[PDB]
C-alpha cells in the first residue's frame, strides 16, 4: 500500500527524544505523527517489533488467565469473593503494566509529546504490577497475623505511589538515568525482603521451605535481579553493537523476563491459595 510509506533509519539521523540506546545503530522507525502509521508498524520489522509483540501476546495471556480465574468453581475457595479480589488486584496490575508497555512501544515514534505521555504510563505500569503482586502473596503469608499484613500493604502502597510520582519527572526518562530507573523499580520489588524476613522469623525455616516460599522467592529474586541487570547494562547489544538491532537486545529480553516473572509469581501465589484450602480458614496454630 501507498499511504504513510516509510523506511527504517540509522540512529545518527534520529531526533533527541528517540535516542534511548546508541548501541542500536540501524533499523529505527523515523518520527511519524500518525497513529494509523504507528499501529500498522506492528506488522513491520524494526527495533520495536519484539518489544511490542512480547507485551501484546503477554497482555492477552494474562487477560485470558485472569478471566478463567474468575470462573473457577468457588468449591475450591476458602472465601471465593475476597480471594478472587486479591488475585484480581494482581491481574489488574499485570494487565495495565503490559497494556501500557505495548501501547507505549507502538506510539513511541509518533511525536515528542505522545512519547513523553506514554513513557510515564509505561513506568507507572511497572509500579502497578509490583504493588499488585504484593496483594495476593501477603494475604496468604500473613493470614493469621492481620496487623503486619495491614502495615506492609500500606508500606508498598506509599513506595509504589512515590515511584509513580518519580516516573512523572522529565530527567527520569533520559538515558543518563537508566541505572536510576533500574534501582528505583528494583528497590520496589526488593523491599519485599523486610516482609519476607519478618515471615521467616515468625514461622521458621522449615515452614517457609515446606510451604515452598523459600524456593519460588529465590526464583523471583533471580528474575528481578537478572532482568534489571540486563536492562541497566544493555546486554548483549553492548558487546555486539549493530548486531542485535532487531532480535535479542536488552529491552526485548527484559520484556520477556517480566512475562516469565509475573507468571512465576502467579504460580507461587496460586499454590499458597491451594495450601490454604487444605488447612482451611481456622487457625488453632
Amino acid at each position: 500500500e501507498f499511504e504513510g510509506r516509510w523506511r527504517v533509519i540509522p540512529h545518527d539521523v534520529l531526533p533527541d527524544w528517540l535516542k534511548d540506546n546508541d548501541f542500536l545503530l540501524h533499523g529505527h522507525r523515523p518520527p511519524m505523527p500518525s497513529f494509523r502509521a504507528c499501529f500498522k508498524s506492528i506488522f513491520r520489522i524494526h527495533t520495536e517489533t519484539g518489544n511490542i509483540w512480547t507485551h501484546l501476546l503477554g497482555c492477552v495471556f494474562f487477560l485470558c488467565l485472569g478471566i478463567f480465574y474468575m470462573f473457577r468453581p468457588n468449591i475450591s475457595f476458602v472465601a471465593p469473593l475476597q480471594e478472587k479480589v486479591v488475585f484480581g488486584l494482581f491481574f489488574l496490575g499485570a494487565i495495565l503494566c503490559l497494556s501500557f508497555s505495548w501501547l507505549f512501544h507502538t506510539v513511541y515514534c509518533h511525536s515528542e509529546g505522545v512519547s513523553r505521555l506514554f513513557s510515564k504510563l509505561d513506568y507507572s505500569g511497572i509500579a502497578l504490577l509490583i504493588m499488585g503482586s504484593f496483594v495476593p502473596w501477603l494475604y496468604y503469608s500473613f493470614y493469621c497475623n492481620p496487623q503486619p499484613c495491614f502495615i506492609y500493604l500500606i508500606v508498598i502502597c506509599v513506595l509504589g505511589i512515590a515511584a509513580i510520582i518519580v516516573s512523572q519527572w522529565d530527567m527520569f526518562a533520559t538515558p543518563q538515568y537508566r541505572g536510576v530507573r533500574a534501582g528505583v523499580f528494583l528497590g520496589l520489588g526488593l523491599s519485599g525482603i523486610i516482609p519476607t524476613l519478618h515471615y521467616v522469623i515468625s514461622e521458621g525455616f522449615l515452614k517457609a521451605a515446606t510451604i515452598g516460599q523459600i524456593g519460588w522467592l529465590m526464583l523471583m529474586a533471580s528474575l528481578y535481579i537478572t532482568g534489571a541487570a540486563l536492562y541497566a547494562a544493555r546486554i548483549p547489544e553492548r558487546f555486539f553493537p549493530g548486531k542485535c538491532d532487531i532480535w535479542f537486545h536488552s529491552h526485548q529480553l527484559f520484556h520477556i523476563f517480566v512475562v516469565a516473572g509475573a507468571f512465576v509469581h502467579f504460580h507461587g501465589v496460586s499454590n499458597l491459595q491451594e495450601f490454604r484450602f487444605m488447612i482451611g480458614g481456622g487457625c488453632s496454630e
Partner: antibody
Amino acid sequence: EVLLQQSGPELVKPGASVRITCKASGYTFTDFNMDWVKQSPGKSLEWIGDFNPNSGGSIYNQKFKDKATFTVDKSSSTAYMELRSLTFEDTAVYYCARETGTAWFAYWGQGTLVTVSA
Amino acid sequence: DIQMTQSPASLSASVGETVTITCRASGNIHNFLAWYQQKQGKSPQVLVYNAKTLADGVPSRFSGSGSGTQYSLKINSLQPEDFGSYYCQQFWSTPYTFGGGTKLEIN
C-alpha cells in the same frame, strides 16, 4: 555534511533526451530514498517520483511515467534521471531531494536547468 | 491524488510583523506535512516537517500548526531575509504534492 551535487545546465533540441546526475556524499547511499522534483519557470514544484537505492525499485507519478526513467550507480553513490522525447513544456529546473525515513526533504541538489530550444 | 491549496498566493508585509500562510489538503494527510522556503534562483530549504517539527538551524520565528486537512505556517517578527517563496508538501499519499506557493515580499 550531506551534499547533493547535480550536473550543469543543459540546452537541448526538441525530441532529444537528457540524463541528469545527482552525486550524493556524506552518508550511506543505500540508507535513504532519492526523489526528483520539477520546477517550471515562475511556477510551483511538482513531484516526478522516488527511487530506492537499496531495493532498486522506483515509484513514478502518473504524469511523468512515460517522460522519466530513474537509474543508479551504487559504487559512486549517484542517482540519475533520464528525460525522453523533450518538448518546450519540459523547460524547467530539475532537483534531486533526499528523504529521511519519510518523504520530507532536508537535503536538495542545487538544481539542473533544462532548456529546450530549436 | 491529494490536492494542496495554499493561501494567500502572494503577500507583502513590513519588518517586525506576523504573517500566516494556510494550507488545505483535499484529503486527510495525517500530519505528514512539510514547509519549504525558496530564495530567487536558489534551491528550497525545509523549515518545518511532520506538521509542527522545526528543522535544524531554523529560527524559532517559524512555527507550523494544524491537523487533518488544515495546516498553517506562521512567521512572527518578519526579518529582511524572510523574502521569497513558501511551499507546503504532503507526503502521506503518493503522488506527493506541493501547494501552489506563496510569494512573500518585505517592505
